[PDB]
């Protein structure tokens, strides 16, 4: 055939891939974390948006830290050979490098490590997108006039 | 270059993209009625541009939308009139378009 370029990810596999949305609204009282009013609006918007991009969307609500880790492990061990990409959206409380399960924190590195090139072979070479709505600390941006 | 078979391996951290709602060290803002500033803006820009723009360009539009259109309102002076910028962290090795063919 003619000249070929290799500058863009192959996104014409039979499936776009999974879009896992973890929507943590209500937290165990002992954590002292507030209910995240408005997050269901986010979860519904994401579900519709990624549906229209042809992702296989799975919405999960109010997962403990243990449930988050088991979900990521399980999802990373699925057959992704027919899938172009992987998307995970995390909606929760957080701190730098951390997102909260309903009963306590999870290191983001623990979640994303399941999908490493050497640990998730059916996603090797494929884009792995993590979308994180959570605090990264307590600084406030005062802005500047333009 | 001393290893043409270098291309036989890729880094285990390659091909990840982390679309953070906010800059390192910062709070992230969520409106109780409208949803979070970032997710609101992300969905709007994907709906408008996923059949048109490469993903990093979509996320740059999200950065601009969050940066320009949102400012907090609070009765607490500490939390009032604050701004947010999201933070695109890319270890991708290729351009990403959600459409094909």
């Amino acid at each position: 055939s003619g000249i070929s370029l290799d500058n863009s990810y192959k996104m014409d596999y039979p499936e776009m891939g999974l879009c896992i949305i973890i929507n943590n609204k209500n937290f165990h009282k002992s954590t002292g974390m507030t209910s995240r009013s408005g997050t269901d609006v986010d979860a519904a918007n994401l579900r519709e948006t990624f549906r229209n991009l042809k992702y296989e969307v799975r919405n999960k609500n109010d997962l403990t830290r243990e449930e988050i880790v088991e979900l990521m492990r399980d999802v990373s061990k699925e057959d992704h050979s027919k899938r172009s990409s992987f998307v995970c959206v995390l909606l929760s409380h957080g701190e730098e490098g951390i997102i909260f399960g309903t009963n306590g924190p999870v290191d983001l590195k623990k979640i994303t490590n399941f999908f490493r090139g050497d640990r998730c072979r059916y996603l090797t070479g494929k884009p792995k997108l993590f979308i994180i709505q959570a605090c990264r600390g307590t600084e406030l941006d005062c802005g500047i006039e333009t | 270059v001393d290893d043409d078979m270098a291309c036989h391996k890729i880094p285990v951290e390659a091909d990840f993209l982390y679309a953070y709602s906010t800059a390192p060290g910062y709070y992230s803002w969520r409106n109780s009625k409208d949803g979070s500033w970032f997710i609101q803006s992300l969905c709007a820009m994907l709906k408008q541009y996923a059949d048109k723009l490469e993903f990093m360009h979509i996320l740059t539009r999200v950065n601009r939308k969050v940066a320009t259109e949102f400012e907090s309102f609070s009765f607490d002076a500490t939390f009032h009139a604050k701004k947010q910028i999201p933070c695109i962290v890319s270890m991708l090795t290729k351009e990403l378009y959600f459409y094909h063919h």
């Binding site: 507030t34 995240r36 009013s37 408005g38 929760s92 409380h93 957080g94 709505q133 959570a134 605090c135 | 709602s21 709070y27 992230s28 803002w29 969520r30 409106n31 109780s32 979070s36 907090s72 309102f73 609070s74 939390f79």
Partner: peptide, 4 residues
Amino acid sequence: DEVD
């Protein structure tokens, strides 16, 4: 407006 609330923080996360």
